[PDB]
Amino acid sequence: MQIFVKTLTGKTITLEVEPSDTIENVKAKIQDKEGIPPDQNRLIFAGKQLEDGRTLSDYNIQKESTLHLVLRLRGG
Q1: CATH of 1-76, one of 3.40.1350.10, 3.10.20.90, 3.40.50.300, 1.10.3720.10
Q2: Residue 30 burial by CB count (10 A; 0-12/13-18/19+): exposed, middle or buried?
Q3: 3-state class of 1 per DSSP?
């Protein structure tokens, strides 16, 4: 049950999750592949911002889906 992640830059990543997992948990594994937490990054599917109140099967997120990684609060 792998999920692919696409950043706005085009960075293709890969994570292991379950259709019963929480949105926050699935976002949390982004730290284990990159290092950036779920407060600096957000989540989007089908033009809708996802949130930590539902699961993957509740959003209809299948395997081989490309998630959308957006940056919150520009800084340097």
Answers
A1: 3.10.20.90
A2: buried
A3: coil
